[PDB]
Write an enzyme that holds these catalytic residues in place. Structure first.
Site, short mmCIF file in Angstrom:
data_model
loop_
_atom_site.label_atom_id
_atom_site.label_comp_id
_atom_site.label_asym_id
_atom_site.label_seq_id
_atom_site.Cartn_x
_atom_site.Cartn_y
_atom_site.Cartn_z
N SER A 122 0.78 -1.26 0.00
CA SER A 122 0.00 0.00 0.00
C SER A 122 0.80 1.30 0.00
O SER A 122 0.22 2.39 -0.07
CB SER A 122 -0.94 0.04 1.20
OG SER A 122 -2.05 -0.77 0.93
N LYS B 130 0.25 3.93 -2.81
CA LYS B 130 -0.90 4.78 -2.88
C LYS B 130 -0.54 6.29 -2.76
O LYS B 130 -1.24 7.17 -3.28
CB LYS B 130 -1.94 4.38 -1.81
CG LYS B 130 -2.69 3.08 -2.22
CD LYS B 130 -3.34 2.37 -1.05
CE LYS B 130 -4.03 1.06 -1.47
NZ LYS B 130 -4.63 0.26 -0.31
N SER C 34 -6.16 3.43 3.63
CA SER C 34 -5.61 2.37 2.80
C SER C 34 -6.68 1.57 2.03
O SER C 34 -6.52 0.36 1.77
CB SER C 34 -4.70 1.44 3.63
OG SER C 34 -3.59 1.05 2.89
N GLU D 253 -5.21 -3.85 -7.03
CA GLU D 253 -5.56 -4.45 -5.76
C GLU D 253 -6.57 -5.57 -6.05
O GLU D 253 -7.47 -5.39 -6.86
CB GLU D 253 -6.22 -3.41 -4.80
CG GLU D 253 -5.26 -2.25 -4.43
CD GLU D 253 -4.23 -2.72 -3.40
OE1 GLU D 253 -3.41 -1.91 -2.95
OE2 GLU D 253 -4.21 -3.92 -3.07
N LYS E 232 2.93 6.57 5.30
CA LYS E 232 2.06 5.63 4.67
C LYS E 232 2.69 4.26 4.82
O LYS E 232 3.83 4.05 4.42
CB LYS E 232 1.82 5.97 3.17
CG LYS E 232 0.91 4.95 2.45
CD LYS E 232 -0.56 5.30 2.67
CE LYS E 232 -1.38 4.26 3.36
NZ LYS E 232 -1.47 2.86 2.87
N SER E 233 1.93 3.34 5.44
CA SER E 233 2.40 1.99 5.69
C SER E 233 1.91 0.98 4.62
O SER E 233 1.12 1.29 3.77
CB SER E 233 2.04 1.52 7.09
OG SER E 233 0.58 1.44 7.20
N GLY E 234 2.45 -0.23 4.68
CA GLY E 234 2.00 -1.31 3.78
C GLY E 234 2.19 -2.67 4.43
O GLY E 234 2.98 -2.89 5.39
N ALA E 235 1.42 -3.62 3.96
CA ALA E 235 1.43 -4.99 4.51
C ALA E 235 1.14 -5.93 3.36
O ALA E 235 0.31 -5.65 2.51
CB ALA E 235 0.38 -5.10 5.58
#
EC number: 3.5.2.6
Lengths: 263, 165
Positions: A45, A48, A105, A141, A209-212
């Site tokens: 993510s 984005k 997100s 996505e 901004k994080s992501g997983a």
């Protein structure tokens, strides 16, 4: 103050996987420290923010309007869509979509925004044209989160991402209006609390901004600094680990704890 | 204490007031306004991109409005997932909810969304289901075999799948 880099090492020992890390001075653009800055890691993510920078660029040039309303259907809805699922009947404006994509997100919002710009090929084209010849988005996505070993689809390098984010946030690439909107969206991130935000001392500014992803993938991009003013960019990615979600969060938080203590 | 859960989702019923929803969900888990308008959005445990969650819609913005909408991701687990791509292929636009469930398996699906635009009448009721194969469901991560089935007045209008084998 050198000790963030040992913690990184620890993080590879505890996690048993690759960790990429870079810290860059926001104003000069100078690299302060790095570890595997030029290996590829899945963006998740994290992309984005880049997506919405492309959308603001189009706005800046009269190609798009933040107030324009997009109507979509149930067929568009994908895994992890808390905001878009709520506004299915009335639709959402472009501005509301970036807000949901970045602060929440929202996966469907990101797909809708991707289609406004022409899809993954066109985001990659945008990044290429501003000098980032590494970062690439290939899928929509939720597939882009697969993190298949050795798969370079939907990847970036810590150094490439840090530089790109600096250019979006400090260059003349975007207007001052667009820069404030992009930074404010990141500052309002509601879903990265267990990561860098968890080590952030009182009074400090952070926009992130994080992501997983699958296969233990987890990462974050951020502009942070003391005295409520951002002064450095930080990018951390990891992939391949078997540790739990909380174990992966802890390691990133601890790296952040170290770069903050050794600022 | 406790975060939003599948059990709390089950207990909340259409017709309930805003205060009832909060009492059952646990106000510390919920928010309203902003991105959610006059709906109440309550967070479960951390999961993948976001958190498991519910979102409750109301008949109007009035303090005394009633629940006409229930939506969730990753709170409810399918009780016996038996969906496969082959069975997904047999699903056809125009089938009833009863016929769809007979094809994909009576325990393969959870309710993603259920909305009554004419509450308390069921006229125009829209129902969206999330369906999974054997190990497709994930409450803390990413699905590994799922489909989205959308209905209006109990009749199938659309279907979509990801990663089914």
């Amino acid at each position: 103050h050198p000790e963030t880099l040992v913690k990184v090492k620890d993080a590879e020992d505890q996690l048993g996987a690759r960790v990429g890390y870079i810290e860059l001075d926001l104003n000069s653009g100078k690299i302060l420290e790095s570890f595997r800055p030029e290996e590829r890691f899945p963006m998740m993510s994290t992309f984005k923010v880049l997506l919405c920078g492309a959308v603001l660029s189009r706005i800046d040039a009269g190609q798009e309007q933040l107030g324009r309303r997009i109507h979509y259907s149930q067929n568009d809805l994908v895994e992890y869509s808390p905001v878009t699922e709520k506004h299915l009947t009335d639709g959402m404006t472009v501005r509301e979509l970036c807000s949901a994509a970045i602060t929440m997100s929202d996966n469907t919002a990101a797909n809708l925004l991707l289609t406004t710009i022409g899809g993954p090929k066109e985001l990659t084209a945008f990044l290429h044209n501003m000098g980032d010849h590494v970062t690439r988005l290939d899928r929509w996505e939720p597939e882009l989160n697969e993190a298949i070993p050795n798969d370079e689809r939907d990847t970036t390098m810590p150094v490439a991402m840090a530089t790109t984010l600096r250019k979006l946030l400090t260059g003349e690439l975007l207007t001052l209006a667009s820069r404030q909107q992009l930074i404010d969206w990141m500052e309002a991130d509601k879903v990265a609390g267990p990561l860098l935000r968890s080590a952030l001392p009182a009074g400090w500014f952070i926009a992130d901004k994080s992501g997983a992803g699958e296969r233990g993938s987890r990462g974050i991009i951020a502009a942070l600094g003391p005295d409520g003013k951002p002064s450095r960019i930080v990018v951390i990615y990891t992939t391949g680990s078997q540790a739990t979600m909380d174990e992966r969060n802890r390691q990133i938080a601890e790296i952040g704890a170290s770069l903050i203590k050794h600022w | 204490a406790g975060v939003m859960t599948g059990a709390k989702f089950t207990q909340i019923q259409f017709g309930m007031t805003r205060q009832q929803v909060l009492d059952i969900a646990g106000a510390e888990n919920c928010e309203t306004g902003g991105s959610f308008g006059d709906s109440i959005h309550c967070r479960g445990h951390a999961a993948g991109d976001y958190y498991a969650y519910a979102t409750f819609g109301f008949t109007s913005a009035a303090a005394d409005a009633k629940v006409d909408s229930k939506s969730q991701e990753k709170l409810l687990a399918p009780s016996a997932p038996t969906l496969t791509l082959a069975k997904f292929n047999q699903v056809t636009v125009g089938m009833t909810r009863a016929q769809v469930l007979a094809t994909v398996g009576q325990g393969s699906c959870t309710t993603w969304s259920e909305y009554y635009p004419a509450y308390p009448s069921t006229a125009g009721v829209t129902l969206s289901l999330s369906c999974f194969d054997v190990d497709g469901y994930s409450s803390t991560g990413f699905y590994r075999g799922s489909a989205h089935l959308a209905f209006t007045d109990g009749v199938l209008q659309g279907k979509r799948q990801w990663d089914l084998v």
